Structure 1
Amino acid sequence: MVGLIWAQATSGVIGRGGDIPWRLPEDQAHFREITMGHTIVMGRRTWDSLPAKVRPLPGRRNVVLSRQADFMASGAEVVGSLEEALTSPETWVIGGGQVYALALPYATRCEVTEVDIGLPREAGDALAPVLDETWRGETGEWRFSRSGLRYRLYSYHRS
Structure 2
Amino acid sequence: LVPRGSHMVGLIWAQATSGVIGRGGDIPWRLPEDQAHFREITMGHTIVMGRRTWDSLPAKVRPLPGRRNVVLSRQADFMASGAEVVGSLEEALTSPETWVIGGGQVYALALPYATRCEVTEVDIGLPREAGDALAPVLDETWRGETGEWRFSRSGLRYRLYSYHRS
Q: Is contact 2:49–2:103 with CA below 8 Å preserved after alignment?
A: yes
How far is the alpha carbon of 1:72 from its aligned partner?
2.1
Q: Is contact 1:25–1:147 with CA below 8 Å preserved after alignment?
A: no
How far is the alpha carbon of 1:137 from its aligned partner?
1.8
Give unmatched runs, 5+ long, in structure 2: 1-7
SS in structure 2 of the partner of residue 102 of structure 1: helix
Q: Is contact 2:48–2:71 with CA below 8 Å preserved after alignment?
A: yes
Across the two proteins, how many residue pairs are aligned to each other?
Answer: 159
Give TM-score, length-normalised by structure 1.
0.98
- Residue of 43, 46, 65 corresponding to 2:72: 65
For the residues of structure 2 that align with 1:146 and 1:105, how far apart are their CA atoms?
36
For the residues of structure 2 that align with 1:67 and 1:39, how far apart are their CA atoms?
20
Q: Is contact 1:111–1:155 with CA below 8 Å preserved after alignment?
A: yes
How far is the alpha carbon of 1:83 from its aligned partner?
2.1
For the residues of structure 1 that align with 2:109 and 2:84, how far apart are their CA atoms?
18
Q: Does 1:102 align with 2:129?
A: no
How far is the alpha carbon of 1:57 from its aligned partner?
0.3
Give unmatched runs, 5+ long, in structure 1: none
Q: Is contact 1:64–1:78 with CA below 8 Å preserved after alignment?
A: yes
Cα deviation, 1:123-152, whole Å, max 9, x if unaligned, reads 100000000001112111101111210000
For the residues of structure 2 that align with 1:147 and 1:43, how far apart are their CA atoms?
29
How far is the alpha carbon of 1:70 from its aligned partner?
2.1
Cα deviation, 1:31-83, whole Å, max 9, x if unaligned, reads 00010110000000000000111010000000000001222211100000012
The residue number in structure 2 matching 1:112 is 119
For the residues of structure 1 that align with 2:154 and 2:110, how far apart are their CA atoms?
30
For the residues of structure 1 that align with 2:106 and 2:94, how far apart are their CA atoms?
16
For the residues of structure 2 that align with 1:72 and 1:23, how far apart are their CA atoms?
27
Q: Is contact 2:9–2:113 with CA below 8 Å preserved after alignment?
A: yes
For the residues of structure 2 that align with 1:147 and 1:60, how far apart are their CA atoms?
28
Q: Over the residues paired in the alignment, what is the CA RMSD in angstroms?
A: 0.6
Cα deviation, 1:12-46, whole Å, max 9, x if unaligned, reads 00000100000111000000001011000000000
For the residues of structure 1 that align with 2:74 and 2:61, how far apart are their CA atoms?
23
Percentage of pairs with the same residue: 100
SS in structure 2 of the partner of residue 132 of structure 1: coil
How far is the alpha carbon of 1:99 from its aligned partner?
0.3
Give TM-score, length-normalised by structure 2.
0.94
Cα deviation, 1:90-131, whole Å, max 9, x if unaligned, reads 100000000011110010000000001111100100000000
Runs of 4+ with >2 A deviation = none
